């Protein structure tokens, strides 16, 4: 099997990665000692993408936890999966950037990028073959977004023939109190447009909306958001973790879902979302394409699905799933582009996530993601027309033309998204 | 692991610094001779007062204070009425005063003494390994406290460009003023120290005098004690356990969005003669007559709020007080993620001077809030500056020390730009 090297940057990336790894090791039947204890032979199949085989039946993850503060590493080690992770792969700085993108992109990210490049090269030179790199980080923070984009640039320079999959968390004002986050988000969006081929746009605004309306929980606690993003990430990666008709092993997913090198912003979603219950096919399908259910602040009625990869997990009849999805596609033919035929790919995995009898995960390159890049850009416009906190970033060697370049690139992306939405077959 | 070096310039700066260090020794339980009863068992630093107090080899807790003035009377007053507390090497005196002239303290009299003060600053900074910056104590009206402050800010911006420097200025008041050219000195030291100061807590003596008149003429001693209490509760969070605003970067980032707009406003509720609920003392922090700057915040828009509570205040009712404050339509925030009242609560009660001017209280509240209402004060100062420059009054006392005539027009242009930027912030 091929090998993926997992990279987590920032405390948001570290926390969501720890919850995601716990969900995966519960699903794959791996204990805290790294030994297999599951009851299905499919769990041990395709395990080399994520878990490195150590001595004496020890399946440790190939995870590179990167941060600039040791408190996040201590919180990772204090959890249940702390001894499960590789202790040699821990990289932590002394001083955090603290919502400073320039400090994590030009000084401290630059001063730790040589060490993380040495760790990446040490992991990569032992690979029989490299499949790609999976990155999970937040676009609003200081070392998260900045060091993620610097790692993306260094990986693209070192390995130009490898895919770059990013679980970029777009910041939102409803859960984050820091005001300078549109600067970091727009700068990282401009870097991810030019130096990345895949992006899973998981938005905290839609997560707060889901926890407020669906789960009826007023408080947007970070544990519930961690659990929801971990469940959606497990449902997304069930194509890579298990063999099937739709393997979608990184490059295949990019060939199917990405028509253009700039318009590669996805929209993951999870239909049976329940906090810490009859489940059937048509209710899951009608919850699959709902605006409220999706984990990005978008309106799918205003956009067109360029590509859809709906994946079902559990014990279900495949004929009924195919009939229901064909009925959904024919009943809503105005919601899909007519110049890309057969854009809905369905795969069924027999192993559900633990705690759920059935699961339904959707990935989509909808045109409605340009509403998110209009919202973040218009919050960036209200923060750049009056130059709030501009002395911090421009004092680190960043030119003020960099913000104008990022704004122009995001406006060009919005213009191209609208232009390709207006075209019809 | 972190150090701060307090700098006091001028007679006002020296007296305010002496009162503040007396209150810091009172609040932390440090004996006046320098020893400590309880915390000297360890004998080392990093005990939450190492940001201000340094320990010598004999165990004496000498403060990291520099007292600079061009008149040695107040320095000898501190050295006599304290003497073993402050080392005589760090207390710099001067021979001739600048005598209510900015140019005298900035070009001729301060220039003959700036190198020794810089050498003493470097000598005190050599003992500091993780220092954050400096607290500049000065006054806008004087000659030393404007000219030497401006030259010191220029030298510290050239030599210490990786550090952030605060400011503790005294805004001039017509009730107690010893000079007529305080508008000239204040405008010139505002224009010179605009790019070299990052947080300026300018407090006028008119508000302190009115508070002492209506709650407690009162002399400079009562004003000094009240101002020392105000500054001690402003910087209470820096010398105590960490909730928020424990660093100079925290002060610069929680309140100062712009490179030029760095003038916060403080307001204090519990001034009683030597009970009161949390909701009313939170409401009294929004009263325009209890602010430390004589201005009306209701005509302007807020930018930030850092409510700091002292004493045994339960954090449950603070949010209810916040809700009752926010239900009123008086506060009109800005419209780019304005956030709200970032309350941090310190459980140590504040200590008052025994038999002084303020009674001991259990609930104390301070409102470090940025607004655009300081533009009224700067408009008053520029109106007084424009009245005394239409006929070129008092001009020759500055040109005789090497200052050019165009410096006044440059400071007028800078103050016009500051007023225009305050208006542009105030206009959506
Ligand atoms: C327009 O008026 C306003 C309205 C609301 C607010 C909200 C107000 N300020 C901001 O968000 C400003 C963020 C800019 C960055 C700047 C750009 C960082 O590079 C600076 C840096 C920091 C550390 C080390 C090196 C460099 O500061 C932060 O991230 C600081 C980190 C520090 C405390 C550790 O953290 C916070 O700010 C807190 C303490 C967590 C919360 N702060 C707030 O709620 C402010 C204003 Cl002025
Ligand atoms: N609140 C307060 N203000 C003071 C005190 N001493 C001086 N001032 C202020 O100082 C201003 C006049 O400046 P000066 O009398 O020249 O004193 P200075 O500012 O220290 O300047 P120099 O005498 O040259 O050192 C007045 O407007 C007062 O407001 C004080 O002890 N308390
Ligand atoms: N969904 C989710 N988002 C988070 C979580 N923690 C932080 N974030 C987001 O990440 C951003 C902060 O980035 P952070 O990782 O703290 O950057 P750093 O401090 O420089 O490492 C904020 O805007 C939050 O919205 C979490 O547990 N869940």
Coordinates of N, CA, C and O in Angstrom, one line a residue, chain A residues 176-179 382-383 386-392, chain B residues 249 252-253 256-259 335-337 339 427-428:
Chain A
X176 N -14.8 33.0 17.2 CA -13.4 33.5 17.4 C -13.5 35.0 17.7 O -14.1 35.8 17.0
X177 N -12.8 35.4 18.8 CA -12.9 36.8 19.3 C -11.8 37.7 18.7 O -11.9 38.9 18.7
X178 N -10.7 37.1 18.1 CA -9.7 37.8 17.5 C -10.1 38.6 16.2 O -10.9 38.0 15.4
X179 N -9.7 39.8 16.0 CA -10.2 40.6 15.0 C -9.4 40.6 13.7 O -9.9 40.8 12.6
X382 N -13.2 45.7 5.2 CA -13.5 46.6 6.3 C -12.4 46.6 7.3 O -12.4 47.5 8.2
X383 N -11.4 45.7 7.2 CA -10.2 45.8 8.0 C -9.0 46.3 7.3 O -8.0 46.6 8.0
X386 N -9.2 50.8 6.7 CA -8.8 51.6 7.9 C -7.6 51.1 8.5 O -7.2 51.6 9.6
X387 N -6.9 50.1 7.9 CA -5.5 49.7 8.3 C -5.4 49.3 9.7 O -4.4 49.6 10.4
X388 N -6.4 48.5 10.2 CA -6.3 48.1 11.6 C -5.3 47.0 11.8 O -5.3 46.0 11.0
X389 N -4.4 47.2 12.8 CA -3.3 46.3 13.1 C -2.3 46.0 12.0 O -1.7 45.0 11.9
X390 N -2.3 47.0 11.0 CA -1.4 46.8 9.9 C 0.1 47.1 10.2 O 1.0 46.7 9.5
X391 N 0.4 47.7 11.4 CA 1.7 48.0 11.8 C 2.4 46.7 12.3 O 3.7 46.7 12.2
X392 N 1.7 45.7 12.7 CA 2.3 44.5 13.2 C 2.9 43.7 12.0 O 4.0 43.2 12.0
Chain B
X249 N 2.9 44.0 25.5 CA 2.3 43.6 24.2 C 0.8 43.4 24.3 O 0.1 43.7 23.4
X252 N -0.6 46.8 24.3 CA -0.5 47.4 23.0 C -1.5 46.7 22.0 O -2.0 47.4 21.1
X253 N -1.9 45.5 22.3 CA -2.8 44.8 21.3 C -4.2 44.7 21.8 O -5.1 44.6 20.9
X256 N -4.9 49.2 21.3 CA -4.3 50.1 20.3 C -4.4 49.5 18.9 O -3.5 48.7 18.6
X257 N -5.3 49.9 18.1 CA -5.4 49.4 16.7 C -4.4 50.1 15.8 O -3.9 49.5 14.8
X258 N -4.2 51.4 15.9 CA -3.5 52.2 15.0 C -2.1 52.5 15.5 O -1.8 52.5 16.7
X259 N -1.2 52.9 14.6 CA 0.1 53.4 15.0 C 0.1 54.7 15.8 O 1.0 55.0 16.5
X335 N -17.8 49.2 14.1 CA -18.4 48.1 13.3 C -17.4 47.3 12.5 O -17.6 46.9 11.4
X336 N -16.3 46.9 13.1 CA -15.4 45.8 12.6 C -15.0 45.0 13.8 O -13.9 45.2 14.4
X337 N -15.8 44.0 14.2 CA -15.6 43.1 15.3 C -15.2 43.7 16.6 O -14.1 43.6 17.1
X339 N -15.9 43.3 19.7 CA -15.9 42.4 20.9 C -16.6 43.1 22.1 O -17.7 43.7 21.8
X427 N -16.1 58.4 11.6 CA -17.0 58.5 10.5 C -16.9 57.1 9.8 O -15.8 56.7 9.3
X428 N -18.0 56.5 9.6 CA -18.1 55.2 9.0 C -17.9 55.3 7.5 O -16.7 55.1 7.0

